[PDB]
Amino acid sequence: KVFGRCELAAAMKRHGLDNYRGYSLGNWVCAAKFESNFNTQATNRNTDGSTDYGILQINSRWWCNDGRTPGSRNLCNIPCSALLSSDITASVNCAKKIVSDGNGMNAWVAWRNRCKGTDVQAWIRGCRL
C-alpha cells in the first residue's frame, strides 16, 4: 500500500507514535516519506547483505528475520515480510523498540539527513488529526 501523507499521519497517531520518546508526529511522517516514499512494500538491499523492509525501512541485521542475513539478530521477533503489510502495526511496534535503543531516530539515516533540524511539522499540516 502507498499511503497518503495525512492518511499515514493518522495511522501513526492511532498507533501511539506522536511524541513517542519525544519525537513529534511530523518526524515519523518525514522519515517514512524519505525512507520508503510511503510505500509499505519498499525493500532495499544493503552492502553487508542485509535488507531494509517496509515503510520505515527496518533492517534485517538487527530487527527482523528474513532467512538470508547470516549471523543477524531478530530483535523485533518478527519475519521481515510482516513489515511489508498494508497494516503498519508491526512496523510501528518494531520502530518503537528501535527508537528506544539509545540512538533515537538517528537509527534512520534519511531522518538524520533530511528531517532532523527541519520544519517537520510541515509533514502534518492540513491533516485532520
From Swiss-Prot:
In the egg white and polymorphonuclear leukocytes. It catalyses: Hydrolysis of (1->4)-beta-linkages between N-acetylmuramic acid and N-acetyl-D-glucosamine residues in a peptidoglycan and between N-acetyl-D-glucosamine residues in chitodextrins. Keywords: Allergen, Antimicrobial, Bacteriolytic enzyme, Disulfide bond, Glycosidase, Hydrolase, Secreted, Signal. GO terms for biological process: cell wall macromolecule catabolic process; defense response to bacterium; defense response to Gram-negative bacterium; defense response to Gram-positive bacterium; killing of cells of another organism. One of its GO terms (cellular component) is extracellular space. It is an enzyme of class 3 (hydrolase). The active site is at E35, D52. It comes from the Eukaryota. Residues 1-129 form the C-type lysozyme domain. Belongs to the glycosyl hydrolase 22 family. This is Lysozyme C. It comes from Gallus gallus (Chicken).
